[PDB]
Amino acid sequence: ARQWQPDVEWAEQFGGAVMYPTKETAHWKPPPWNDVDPPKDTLVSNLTLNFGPQ
Amino acid sequence: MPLVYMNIIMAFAIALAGLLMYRSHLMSSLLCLEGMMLSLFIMSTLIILNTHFTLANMMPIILLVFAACEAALGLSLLVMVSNTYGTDYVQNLNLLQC
Amino acid sequence: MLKIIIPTTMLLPMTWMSKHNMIWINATVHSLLISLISLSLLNQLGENSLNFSLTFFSDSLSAPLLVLTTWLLPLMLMASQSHLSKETTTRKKLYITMLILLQLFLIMTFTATELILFYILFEATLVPTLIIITRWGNQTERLNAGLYFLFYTLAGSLPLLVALVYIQNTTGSLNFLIIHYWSHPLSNSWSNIFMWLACIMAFMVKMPLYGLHLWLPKAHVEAPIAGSMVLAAVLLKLGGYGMMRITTILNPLTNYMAYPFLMLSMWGMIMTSSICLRQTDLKSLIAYSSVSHMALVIVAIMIQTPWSFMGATALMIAHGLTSSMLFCLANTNYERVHSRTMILARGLQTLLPLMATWWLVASLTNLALPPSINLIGELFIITASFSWSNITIILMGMNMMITALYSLYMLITTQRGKYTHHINNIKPSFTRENALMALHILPLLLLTLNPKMILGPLY
Amino acid sequence: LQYGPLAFVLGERTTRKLTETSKVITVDGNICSGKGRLAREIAEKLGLRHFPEAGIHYADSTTGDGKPLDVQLSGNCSLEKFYDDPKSNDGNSYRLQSWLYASRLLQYADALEHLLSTGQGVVLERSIYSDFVFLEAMYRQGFIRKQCVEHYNEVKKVTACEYLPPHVVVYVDVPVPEIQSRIQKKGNPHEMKITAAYLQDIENAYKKTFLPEMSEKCEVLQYSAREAEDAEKVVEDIEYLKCDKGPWPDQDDRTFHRLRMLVQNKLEVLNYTTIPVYLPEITIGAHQSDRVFQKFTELPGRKYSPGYNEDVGDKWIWLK
Amino acid sequence: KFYIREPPHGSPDWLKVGLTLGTSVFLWIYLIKQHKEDVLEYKRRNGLE
Amino acid sequence: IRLQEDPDPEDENLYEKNPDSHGYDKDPIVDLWNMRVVFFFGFSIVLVLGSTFVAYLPDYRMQEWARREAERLVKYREANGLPLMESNCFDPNKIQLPE
Amino acid sequence: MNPIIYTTLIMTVMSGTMLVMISSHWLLIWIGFEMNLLAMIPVLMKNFNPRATEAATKYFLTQATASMMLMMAIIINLLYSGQWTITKMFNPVAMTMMTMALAMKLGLSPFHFWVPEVTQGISLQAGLLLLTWQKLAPLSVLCQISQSINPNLMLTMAMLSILIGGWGGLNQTQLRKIMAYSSIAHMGWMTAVLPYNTTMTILNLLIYITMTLAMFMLLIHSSATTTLSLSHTWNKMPVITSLMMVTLLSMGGLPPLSGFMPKWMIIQEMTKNESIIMPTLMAMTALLNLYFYMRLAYSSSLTMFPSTNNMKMKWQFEHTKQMKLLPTMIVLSTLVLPMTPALSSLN
Amino acid sequence: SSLLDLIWLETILPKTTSFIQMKMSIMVSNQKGLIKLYFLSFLITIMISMTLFN
């Protein structure tokens, strides 16, 4: 009795990583909202030295 | 055309092929990029000296200046990438997808 | 033509500056006034066309189509005001603006004196139509329908643009008078074959030709009432008008390249009538009837005789009026029960008598009942096709039989029988709906009284 | 003129404007504590501007006229309904929590803008960084869902990762039995229906997560009810907090310029509060959205820009 | 007084209004003078008047 | 449920509030005047006046003129023994055929 | 980044482009390109994040390789002619090197991947500046050296650009990637018409720049970087969505909008040179661009997607910052078809 | 209605063309964003341009 409008299913169709998903593209993820990726836990690996005894 | 120009152009071609074929390091590709401009400098000065283009002798100096400007830019990008990922590997520059 | 073009461009500010409760009244009154003004173009000459200026001209073929457009606008306004009561004032004004823009583009299309300007305008008619369909359609399929319509038309029309610019480069002008007085025979070659294909295929897609028609059921079924009215009445006639205008320079190659299109049109006319026999949707039934009638028009244009052009013009006008009326009737019944299934609502003859009378008259005009202009055009086309060959009579007779069968089947299913027991929201027919039907039907009978006004330049 | 890059190059500098007392102080506590009185007294004695708790209709108070709008047009949530029927099937609990988080984010942006453009300190009755305790209490009581918690975490990350932490965090610690006694004495039935575990979960979140988290950023003051009732000692303790190990000493004129540009743009502040995550609690259908937006535009002073509303008494529109 | 906070465009920016109106008037006057001079120069060059 | 969506409203009947409604608008006065303007302009003005205008349009197609010209030509040709219809549209003297 | 530093970097980018467009010496043209790249990199890396850093790195590598190839072409042309003035190059090998270097700078296929990658990496303002200016300069050089361009290579690269842009934009859902593929397709059109009428190339460049500026300003106004983010704009300011829908219709080439004029004039000019298959294929391939424009238009304007609850507060607040010339860009990108014969003035 | 109008006339023009466009779009956009890969592609393109075009 009223004009049809898009719903959550339509929005989820239009809101994937890419249109027409494949295996690799389904393995893909959408980018972060503020384009800032979470920092990686890179280990500093400071040099270790033996100052002495000789 | 003498064979010296042949060797210089071959050197430029080798340096260009080296840049277009990465292995692991962004630093090695920067080194290949610096070699291309070295070959360009040598070719340009060999052409200019042979033909006695007196006013053209200042062109290779400007070429070197902008070569090392590009080198500085590449080193800055490399240090930022290294700080981000822990290694200068080009495999980590894959967040953006074509 | 400015005395008709400018009043529409003034209708736009009137719509956007009127009060919220007076938009429909103002638009309807001034659309009727513009139609009355545009009735003057029917005074045509017997030797040449009416050349107003270097840009716009009118002919015995352009005049009836312009009058039909100007008369059709207020009917679309009435139907839209029926089904758009709950919309906001801004969106009502936007809808009226879309209708006004479509009418303006159609007027400029039918009056354009140059092929490239005609192309630009008849392509410009897509944007308001696409917006109307994909924005104010009711079902989920309006998006797919709009995509199909747009891409069919554009895939047809882009090679037409290439052909037009190539013709301009080769000959020096795309002005219709120049290309008619300076026309030269088209030699039998692959290049000329593909130029012919480009032009004719663009207009066949616009017609639509059988095998290129799916966009028509998709768009007509899923468009709002005004969109459905304008799609069948006028927008389908752009292809026929273009083919009548463009075939001046395509001879004598048309005598040999018309066979596939003639076979497609005849057999697809039969096929679409048979489809109408077994349709579970009323709008789809009307759309396929439109397909059959336009296939008959295609046959007439392709056989290309002075007797076929007159019948083609008469059939175009009559089909426009009849299809608009049928779409309006279907829309009224849809507004009653909120569903397009044909067998859902029955007994409407005993629930709504005068609406049943309107249904009967519309169905009688849909089939070729003499002396209606539908019959005049169909009979002229049938006679011209008989002169072309003597089995076209077999095909036309089969088509006429199936046409009567499906028209009366629609009438009996919708009106006769016993009413549905559980449907109890069928209120008495509105004065607005009855006036809409009367304004649809009376001009048809008046044109039956005076038939030479819609027989084209060949009369 | 309005603050911008041209003003920055002209010479308006946040560090120049600061007067060594421009401090952000947030008073926190459990439900029905004396934190409001403590914040009022601290703001009055230290001369700082007081921002009460960012409840519903705070955005109504800061825009248009001060009068709050209808609940249907602002928030679409009820604290009374949350108290009466916490486990509603219409998502009222998480709608209320997300709206309150957005309100707190807006209030923090306003307070930062005031501090940066005036130099005066601000005393908030609650902040962004203490809002999650209610979310944790709601989740551990089963009032909301894990998807709601995840959406809240995403929004909180992408929004609050951009603003500076408060200078001073003053927490008033009150045991749960005293909280319930104060609630009983207050007499409001809706909060009288609050269970004991829900009050306990807020305290657990405050003590185990919020206080340890904010202690690393800067110094945190913890007071009991008796200590908080005497605000003179609280103000004296605040005045002698010379230590500052937060990012405020590290901030520069360019960073302050970026922060001021961000906080003065409210649409840029609330940019990520509406991200396309279609939770049933917060998602609103097309028809309801259109009808509510039409009503909001039909409101008296909302159809056009603030300077261009004729019906509220704006003149010279044709030359504006 | 309807808004709790003073709107940015509560009062007309009279400097901007004056600049806009003056610029419009100056441009129209310059265009009229330019058209007059162009017509006169065309007449002079083609020997009409 | 997955949204906060309004329920589909019941269909509205114009006859409920206005028993004598023409179906144009909710407001009775605007509805009546819309009906009046539509009926008057459309039916009376357009139908009657345009139809009589088309009926009395001047003979610019030269049907009557062509009939009179044909009558004169038939009279002249039959009064002098000439054929009623010429065998050539143009003059073979003025047409120069190639050799 | 300091505002003075940002504005001086922008002015340095523009200075490099102007040096390229006014220089008559190949060395000075190369200097202009180098200065443009050097000042452009920090503009891309203004908003620091891993994505911005990666986009800047890829763009720098591509532009450095292209500049090296361009300098090699200059040196080779000098060897066989002893000339530095920018005219018809005197060596076919030098011309091929120069054409490939300039195509790589412009992002023409098969040198296109960096365009969507960098555009998705960088912000909206950075993408706007990138597309507009970095297409403005190399096309100026190509127009200068058009008379010696190899038609076969140029048309092959143009057709590849059109096809690849259409397909990529068809697949993508991110607005910046869609804009990048649209840029690729329009670059294909312009470079296809280049070896016949540089005036038509400039006309298409102007129309494309206007439409891209309007679209990017609208995206900045809506603060949307994805399709779903754009799907909420109708509930906050439906005017922006309607204007963007009209602009999208224009970008697809639908008459009577401004976007039809470049395609129309290019088809006419290319047909004048007895070429029909290429204009027909180019016209037919643009339907992919129109399809994904229409798909974007369905989500944003012609339909109403679900909204959220904080959109009420977004309603309560107002857009403070103004992007001047946006109405002018919207008008000029939709309603300048009747003013077509001004291309003679452009000539 | 079914076999011709709803099945085969749909299969020939609109469905086959759309399927081809979708497949080609997936093929073009299915890139992992590896500079090594598309720079090797650049090298192949440069060699092809140098040799094939004369």
Ligand SMILES: CCCCCCCCCCCCCCCCCC(=O)OC[C@H](COP(=O)([O-])OCC[N+](C)(C)C)OC(=O)CCCCCCCCCCCCCCCCC
């Ligand atoms: C030598 C002379 C030859 C004849 C010349 C004739 C010249 C006539 C000049 C005067 C014409 C204008 C006055 C009459 C207008 C019609 C009024 C009427 O009949 O109302 C009765 C009818 C019936 O009236 P009613 O039903 O409301 O009233 C019945 C009586 N009571 C009050 C008791 C209920 O009016 C209507 O139905 C009103 C409908 C709307 C009318 C809007 C009119 C607008 C103004 C006129 C515009 C005309 C444009 C025509 C098109 C352009 C030109 C071709």
Ligand SMILES: CCCCCCCCCCCCCCCCC[C@@H](O)O[C@H](CO[C@H](O)CCCCCCCCCCCCCCC)COP(=O)(O)OCC[N+](C)(C)C
């Ligand atoms: C309830 C009971 C119903 C039945 C009874 C009703 C009342 C009795 C009516 C009986 C009518 C029976 C038919 C008799 C008609 C007599 C009048 C008719 O013969 O005149 C025609 C008049 O024809 C008209 O031209 C028909 C008008 C056509 C109007 C077309 C539509 C008008 C505009 C509508 C806009 C819609 C546009 C639609 C697309 C174009 C003949 O034309 P013509 O012999 O030469 O006129 C002679 C005058 N001359 C010599 C100067 C020429």
Ligand SMILES: CCCCCCCC/C=C/CCCCCCCC(=O)OC[C@H](COP(=O)(O)OCCN)OC(=O)CCCCCCC/C=C/CCCCCCCC
């Ligand atoms: C192409 C053009 C060719 C030339 C055309 C020339 C003719 C020009 C046509 C003029 C248009 C005629 C007016 C159009 C209809 C106006 C509709 C109208 O009257 O409005 C209704 C109107 C007012 O609105 P409300 O219904 O009250 O709504 C209240 C909401 N709270 O209703 C009323 O109450 C009015 C009742 C008394 C008014 C009677 C008017 C009768 C009509 C004749 C007036 C026109 C004068 C004649 C001028 C002739 C000029 C040639």
Ligand SMILES: Nc1ncnc2c1ncn2[C@@H]1O[C@H](COP(=O)(O)OP(=O)(O)O)[C@@H](O)[C@H]1O
């Ligand atoms: N984020 C939130 N989620 C749910 N409820 C909240 C939130 N923030 C505040 N409230 C409610 O608002 C009310 C504010 O009361 P409060 O001002 O703390 O009382 P008092 O001033 O006596 O301390 C509390 O009952 C609390 O439950």
